[PDB]
Design a protein. Structure first.
Lengths: 56, 153, 465
DNA sequence: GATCGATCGATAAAGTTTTTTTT
DNA sequence: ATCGATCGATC
């Protein structure tokens, strides 16, 4: 929300997570929309747990 | 004033060589062990001595043995002069050395900062990558050939 | 008050301004860290300096910012940081004497009043690495965060000199106190002692310690392209060989700069080299009490200690009671029941496990690495047959021989945790039988022979095929 | 005999691709 | 090419 939010709201208004973002990244390939979804969640990763105790 | 102190430790060590540190009589431990140290030496001709830290600590009760622990970087060419005097009076080419052994404590190599300049400190460890056997000099007969080269520094 | 050509510092008001601040404190700083302390830490600790006789007072030195006055002293510490510690070493001797004048039975007023105590202003200010150290920072406190790499042993330093010429007895001892040694050009000690051979007996005057350590900063949010650079260290006090190489570190250093000679044999010099001088450093038989022995005897009164140690070893692991038996049993690794003649048996045993892949096979081994402070950890070809022990390696400091021990000898007081015992090469997996049997490693290297032992204890974590 | 000036002599350099047995 | 040491000359 650091004054570029007018272009960040466009994802929140239009939505379209599952396919428009899939067609966004690497649109130069033949087919394979399923496998370009398997990478983008690794681009945001996903933290397992702030474990606190000795369980790394 | 260390000259006479060096002369004090000259004779006090020499007087220690006049006595023994023998505690038992004819149950083993024959008396006057330092006189026999001269006696074995005048047969096999090895040019050594062997003195321990115990029996020199337990004569002056540490009033003298504690002094040489911090000074015998300088006192080492002093005690050699006294034993060189007592040998002619007790025995018939003569170079020697001073061989202390068996101090109480044992240190590691990581403990040498400031007190270890001129001290005596038994050190353990292992040994690797030796070298050869070369000669050293310690005394010259060299002099200039201007008039006569017989100056012996 | 006095005035120096260099500084603008005062006379001993700030010492007295500290001494009333030191003694009449009892609490401060309650407002900057507002949460809601009856007596100051230092007040008990200043009594604690004499009764142990130590020389070091680790001053937090963020107390002058909490105090109303002594800001001028506080903002002269960070601007002339050599005279201010040179002032306060005199005061702490007198402020200790300020306690001995009350109780005259405190160490006879002579012998502890000879060894000079000192102080250590640490954790002051904040700093952020190396890409901010401007040339204006000439004499300031710096707070580095980084990592030391490698050390050299102590070399000596000219703190006192000695002289003797060729007369009978003349044993003067000049001082240096600079980078300059001063000599006489004509003799002394007698009337007819003209200008002659004044000689330098070097191995007689005493020296202190000194040590240089190399540091390289940790990559702490570096912008992923910049190479982490380096800077050196230097120390003077009794901190030599108390900071081993290879740990996270913080230093409380001042700043200096030295000249260098370009040619090795002239007095010519001009791009300088800086280095820091540390005042205090910080990283980040146990003292056996009797309450712990009383606490475990309550647990030793409980018969289910086997079951109590069965449940304690697994904070997350599934139950599996059979594997938990020998693991604590191997950790309870017997003793050396050794006879005088014959035998030399030791009660150490060796468990192993293999089977289903990734059933916390490694994390259990990581968990065993937690419970023992002095142990090993195997690697994937971090060690090898010749890479374990028996080294020849041409090190970058002296290019000579070094015999570093392998991990099996390195576990003298631990448990050898080792893995990959189906992918290990058959050049190795041939010397562990000897440490299984004669408890030793026989070294056949070009350097030397040695039948050194290895007080060891092993477990094996294999894998299916 | 000592001090100053002039002349002569000595002092500074740098490496890391082909080829052998061997495991 | 520069610096240091030694020798010679002058006061």
């Amino acid at each position: 929300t650091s004054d570029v939010e007018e272009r960040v709201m466009e994802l929140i208004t239009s939505g379209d997570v599952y396919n428009r973002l899939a067609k966004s990244i690497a649109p130069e390939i033949y087919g394979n929309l399923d496998v370009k979804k398997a990478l983008l969640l690794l681009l945001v990763g996903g933290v397992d747990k702030r474990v606190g105790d000795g369980m790394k | 004033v260390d000259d006479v102190t060096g002369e004090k430790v000259r004779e006090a060590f020499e007087q220690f060589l006049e006595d023994f540190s023998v505690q038992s009589t004819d149950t083993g431990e024959v008396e006057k062990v330092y006189r026999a140290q001269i006696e074995f030496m005048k047969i096999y001709d090895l040019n050594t001595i062997y003195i321990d830290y115990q029996h020199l600590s337990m004569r002056e009760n540490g009033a003298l043995a504690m002094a040489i622990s911090e000074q015998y970087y300088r006192f080492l060419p002093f005690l050699q002069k006294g034993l060189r005097r007592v040998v002619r009076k007790y025995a018939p080419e003569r170079v020697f050395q001073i061989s202390f052994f068996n101090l109480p404590t044992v240190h590691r190599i990581r403990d040498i900062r400031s007190e270890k300049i001129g001290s005596l400190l038994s050190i353990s460890g292992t040994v690797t990558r030796t070298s050869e056997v070369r000669p050293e000099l310690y005394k010259a007969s060299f002099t200039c050939d201007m008039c006569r080269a017989i100056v012996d520094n | 008050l006095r005035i120096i050509w260099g500084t603008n510092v005062s006379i001993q008001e700030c010492t007295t301004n500290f001494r009333n601040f030191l003694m009449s404190f009892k609490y401060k700083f309650r407002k900057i860290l507002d949460e809601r302390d009856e007596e100051l830490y230092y007040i008990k600790q200043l009594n604690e300096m004499r009764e142990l006789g130590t020389s070091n007072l680790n001053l937090d030195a963020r107390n002058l910012l909490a105090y109303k006055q002594t800001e001028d002293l506080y903002h002269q510490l960070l601007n002339y940081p050599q005279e201010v510690i040179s002032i306060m070493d005199q005061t702490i001797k007198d402020c200790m004497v300020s306690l001995i004048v009350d109780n005259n039975l405190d160490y006879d007023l002579d012998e502890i009043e000879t060894k000079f105590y000192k102080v250590r202003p640490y954790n002051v200010g904040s700093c952020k690495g190396m890409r901010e150290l401007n040339p204006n920072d000439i004499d300031k406190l710096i707070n580095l965060k980084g990592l030391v790499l490698r050390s050299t042993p102590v070399i000596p330093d000219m703190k006192v000199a000695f002289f003797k010429c060729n007369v009978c007895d003349h044993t003067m001892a000049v001082e240096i106190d600079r980078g300059v040694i001063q000599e006489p050009a004509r003799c002394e000690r007698i009337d007819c002692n003209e200008p002659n051979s004044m000689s330098l007996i070097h191995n007689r005057c005493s020296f202190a310690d000194k040590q240089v350590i190399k540091l390289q900063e940790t990559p702490d949010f570096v912008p992923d392209g910049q190479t982490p650079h380096s800077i050196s260290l230097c120390v003077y006090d009794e901190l030599v060989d108390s900071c081993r190489a290879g740990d996270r570190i913080e230093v409380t250093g001042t700043f200096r700069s030295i000249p260098i000679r370009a040619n090795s044999r002239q007095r010519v010099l001009s791009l300088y080299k800086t280095y820091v001088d540390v005042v205090h450093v910080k990283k980040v038989v146990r003292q056996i009490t009797d309450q712990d022995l009383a606490k475990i005897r309550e647990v030793a009164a409980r018969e289910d200690l086997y079951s109590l140690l069965a449940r304690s070893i697994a904070p997350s692991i599934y139950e599996l009671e059979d594997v938990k038996k020998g693991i604590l049993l191997q950790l309870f690794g017997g003793t050396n029941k050794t006879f005088t003649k014959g035998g030399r048996y030791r009660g150490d045993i060796n468990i192993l496990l293999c089977g289903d892949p990734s059933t916390s096979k490694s994390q259990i081994l990581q968990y065993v690495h937690k419970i023992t402070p002095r142990g090993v950890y195997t690697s994937g070809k971090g060690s090898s047959a010749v890479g374990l022990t028996a080294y020849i390696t041409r090190d970058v400091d002296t290019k000579q021989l070094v015999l570093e021990s392998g991990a099996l000898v390195l576990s003298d007081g631990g448990v050898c945790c080792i893995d990959e015992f189906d992918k290990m090469s058959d050049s190795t997996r041939s010397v562990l039988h000897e440490v299984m049997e004669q408890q030793t490693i026989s070294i056949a290297k070009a350097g030397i022979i040695t039948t050194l032992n290895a007080r060891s204890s092993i477990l094996a974590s294999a894998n299916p095929i």
